[PDB]
Symmetry: C8
Subunit: 241 residues, 8 copies
């Protein structure tokens, strides 16, 4: 179950970043959404969690920095807010055929906790079946169904086991198959306590701004600026200033 | 269990809206009550919840915006308040035969929580028998029976599983058969907690202005005029100004 | 389990009101005690719950407005306050033979919760056995035995199940057989919480007045007058001013 | 299990009252202790509860108002306070042979809760052996034994079922065999909660005036003189002024 | 299980009182410790509970008022304070041989709750085996062992059952065999709550006085004098002034 | 299981007292430590509990007041504090051979609660082997082991049964074999609650005066000089002034 | 299981003290660490618990006062702080070969509660296998593993049983085999409540001083000096001033 | 299961220290990270926990003080933060081939609590395969996974057994195979309670000075400069001033 630091280093040579579509957002992430990791984005009422989701369905398809070839995406929706129509705009911003974009994204709704966990079994199996093909796993959103199946607090032990059973699979998939995984989450402080904090390597908070300007901070300070970043929402998705 | 975002797009090209009978109310809703989704209206007593329900029994039959051909409705009454006679008056406002309108609405009373969920299984299979014939599924109201078979504060574990079961079924119904589902609900904020909040993809608060005038509002604000709309109750159902 | 709104409308053509004996009381009820429904009356110490009970045993027998032929009544007593002698007066006020009146009312005492539920099985079965014959089911009073068999509050889950099991049968009987059902209830706010509030379509509160004057309000406001009504108690039962 | 209100009326024509020995006390009661009902007297220590019990042992034997022929009594003593010698003195006041009076009262001590309920089964079957011979059933006192086999505040679930069992039996006895049942009870308001309140159809509070003078009062007021009466205790039992 | 009031009266003709040795104490008891009953005496630290115990072992042997022949005594000791030597003095005060006195008293120590209950089975059986022979059953003290076997308060249900099981046997023995039973009890208000209050027909409190003077009050007032009595402790046991 | 109070008297003629070595202390006790009883001494640290224990190891051997012939002792040590060498010094004060004294004391350490109770069964049977040879049974101390195998406030149910078992055994031992039992106990008032209070028939509180001077007191006062006594600890054991 | 006080006295002739290396410490202990007993030493953060431990590994090997020949030691370490290198210094202070010292000490680490209890079985068995050979059993520290295996307070019943199971074996070993047992313990007041207080015959507290001076008090006062003692820590272990 | 303190000494002659790369930090530690022990570093975010971990991956390979030959490392990552690329930079500072260094570190990710403990069993057996080849075992971090599979305050019973199991294994590993084990841990004071405190034989707190400067401190003070040390983080790992 070990491998040498050399063999692991070989493995990390192959780590890619997928661009968010904001140069400013990307610097703050050291290139973009990092593979072999979970990146988590949260925010209240109406932050750009979901605009980021749609934007990555396109940008993950594109050759990017560092010799990233682009590839396929998987999309699990628990919010019933995925809309293929939104991608066709973002596609134009990036000058690629909408048809081909919409082909390279696999989509499933999740309706229960359990369902959501079953979908991950399938996605793991599918990544296994041939590799280097899929580059992103998006889950929008990560825990909402867990709040739903296990409300009140005599239930909490169980939610915790299940939720953790599931984020440990997420981590594994991520690392085992070299995909970036991006998840959204809501707030009550983000939900999911220690269990979710531990699973995600990068946590990003999201807040509003001068109209359509928006603010990403690496959650948990320091109050220093270069730990933050400004981007806008637009017809063509996540962009700059 | 996935499909490509292209296949999904093909499936959403068929999404429709059932006008509420208010141009103001419709605008708020991006056209009216939406397919492949649950719309929930909650409000005080005497607010349009039930008036809206009756109205939709007719407007769902009307050919409409977006290519919407009109179709049949299924109505589940937990409140003992459905009145085929209101439909006659509303049918007049829309210039349509009473008998025909009343022939196109299937109706059942639900007397218990369990009963309510057995009615869904029947509705589900009815939709499966021929696709496209039914367009709307009204439940008036969604959760009264659950408060009924489950109150006294230390009992929600059981209620909550059951409620969540039904609402995941509803979503699946909704999305799988391209129908709009529309439900009313009571207050204390709205009842149902996270479970119900999650399941409805649009939630409308209702309250009254001067007499016949009522106000509709997307729950969770914001205090922008674009998120409120004004309508009136008449002999002919939900109407304008 | 559905029927069309047309077939249901047919069914509602046959809905009757039984007069309370107060023209003023009747307006407030839109004709009287409505069939296919539960009407609930509550009030403290010594309100006219029980005078109303006796009055309906006679007025339900009489041809009334809307082509109502009159018919038979069933009377379940949990209070041990039914008194056939009282009916003989009310009979005189209405000019009909006391013998015949006393013949058209079926009477049973209930001594336990369960007993009360067994009596309803029999009454359902009896309505089934030939129809159009019975027009009223009176239960005086609705829940008193449930307070008795399930006092203290480790018992409450059970009371709730039983009580609700029973009001769901009541609703069904009502609707299935087109009878009016009238029940009395006492106060601690009426007893029975959400369970009883939901089951009864019409709730009437009762308070005292200028000697023998008495006051019915549709429970839960608005503080508007036409939601209220004045009647008197007399030798001949419920009457006006 | 029903009868017609005519059959019931025939059955109530036989209802009787056993004078208390006070014209004032009787008036309060519409003639005295009533058949087909449970009358409960509760009071402080030293109030007439027991004096009333002894008195009725004799007055139940006397031919009385309303056609009442007089008959035999069954007396159940939980208090160890019955004294055949009091009856001798009371018999003198009514001009009746001691032996005869003492021959017409059947007596048992109850030593436990369970015992008390086994005595009822015996009484029930005794009444069934010949109808009309027994007229009164006194239990002095009703619930002392239940406080005894069930105290410590977290134990009432069991007590309450048992108590309710017995009191439903009592009612059935009472109504089925046309007997008056009369019971005493203790204070802290009266003990017994809803269970006992429901079962007694008339409840009398007792308290003392100047020495030999005692006051009786229908429990639950109102503060009207017509609901209070004054009596005296003597060597000859409950008497007037 | 019933008998007639006449047959019961026969039975009560045979009720005797055993003199306490205080004329003043006796008036307050209406002749002395009454047969067919439990008489209970309590008091703190060092009241004359135990001097009364020893005195009755002698006075119960003596012909007394009302044609009482005297007879045998049973003595159950839980306090390890019975001392035959004390009786020899009291014997002298009454001029009877100490030998014969000490012969007419049966003695057993009780070391546990259960033990104490087993001793009563034997005593009942012994009274049965021939009657008219034993006149007193003394238990010193009544409940002390119950406090011991069931300390803390998760135990209380059990203590209550056992304690009540036992006082119901006591009552029965008393009544069934026409013996006086006298028991002592200590204080925390006496111990044993409703259970012991109910079982004892007569309760006497005991307090100190002008040196060796002592004060008996019928427990529970009224604050009237003739409900009290003064006696002294002496070489010869309970006496007057 | 009873005997006559004459037989009992014969049995108490043999009751003895073992001098404590203080004339003051003895007077308090009516002669010293008593047969057929448990005497309990409790006190602070450094009070004579253990000094008294050693002393009695010798004085129980001495011919004494009342005809007391002297005999053997059994000593159970839970405290690991018995010191045959103290006895040598005490033996000198009484002018008795060390070896003989040390030969007449049987000794065991108890290491657990259970162990302590198994030692009793052995002692019991030893006393039964020949009557009259052993005179004293010392347990130093009575309950330390019970606090040890049972602390944490929610565990006493089990401790208390066990403790009560042992102390009922002790009493039976005590009374059946005419031995004195003498026990020490700790403070916090004394430990042991009602259980221990009941079992000891005399309880002595101990505390110190100026240095070598200690004060003994019957627990439960009263503040009379006759209930206190003064003694001294020396090389020769408990002594006077 | 008893033996005579004479045979026990024989046994106590053979009780030895092992010198701590502080003449001042020794006086306070009446010669040193006493055999047939548990001696407990506690103290905070960094007291000389562990310097005492190492010092006894050497001084127990040396002929001392009272004809003590010296002998072998057993050392159970739960702290992972035993260091044979420290003994080689202390050996020099006492002028004995380090080799031979290190040979006469048996060492084991304990890693769990249970483990610690298993080690004692072995040590008992080893003492049995030939006697007079081992003179000390050191456990450093006594309870730390019990805090570890049973943290939180739903666990406490269990810890208590185990801990007490174990100190009762300790006491037995001590007494049965005539070894001194010395244990260390930490503080939250020392840990282990009544259970550990009872098991140890001598308890010593330890505090800091004028640099390397250190202070032993017999735990639990009196505030008198001769209940205290000053010693230093040095290259050669526990010494004086 | 014991060995002689001589055998133990032979075993400790082989104890080693792995330099941290700071002369100040090493001095604090008596040479660096120690064999046969667990050293735990805890600190805020951004403190050297992880920098130290990377550094040791290299310094454990270097021939060192005390005869330390250098050897291989096993690294268990719960944090997803190991970066073979840092080692390259650190390897440069020490003038050592990257490949060789990376070949000598065995690495595994742990994804659950259980997983983490299964990795130990594997490590244990790996050490057993050839002794002396591995020198260091790093767990980064020790307990994150235990907070993860066990939070919500009423669940620690289970967590705590498991945690304690693993840490007793660790100690045994540590001591049996002469390896240093080094672990990081998080704050809230450090997490882990008594269980973790007991298992680590040295605990270091970490916090930062001006930028690159960090401060190390033995947890549990004292506020003496000798117990603090200052180091710096660089491209070349933990360094000096």
């Amino acid at each position: 179950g070990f491998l040498t630091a050399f063999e692991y280093s070989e493995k990390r040579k192959m780590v890619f970043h997928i661009t968010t579509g904001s140069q400013e957002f990307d610097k703050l992430l050291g290139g973009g959404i990092e593979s072999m990791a979970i990146t988590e984005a949260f925010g209240e009422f109406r932050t750009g969690k979901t605009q980021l989701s749609h934007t990555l369905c396109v940008t993950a398809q594109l050759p990017g920095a560092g010799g990233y070839p682009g590839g396929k995406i998987i999309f699990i929706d628990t919010e019933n807010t995925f809309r293929p129509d939104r991608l066709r705009d973002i596609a134009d911003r990036f000058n690629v055929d909408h048809d081909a974009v919409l082909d390279n994204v696999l989509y499933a709704r999740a309706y229960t906790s359990e369902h959501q966990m079953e979908l991950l079994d399938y996605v793991a199996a599918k990544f296994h079946e041939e590799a280097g093909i899929f580059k992103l796993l998006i889950i929008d959103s990560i825990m909402a169904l867990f709040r739903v199946d296990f409300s009140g607090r005599g239930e909490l032990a169980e939610r915790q086991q299940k939720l953790a059973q599931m984020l440990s699979r997420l981590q594994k998939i991520s690392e085992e198959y070299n995909v970036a995984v991006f998840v959204t989450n809501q707030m009550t402080k983000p939900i999911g306590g220690h269990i979710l904090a531990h699973a995600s390597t990068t946590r990003i908070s999201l807040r509003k701004g001068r109209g359509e300007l928006r603010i990403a901070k690496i959650y948990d300070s320091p109050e220093m600026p270069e730990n933050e970043a400004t981007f806008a929402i637009t017809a063509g998705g996540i962009g700059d200033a």
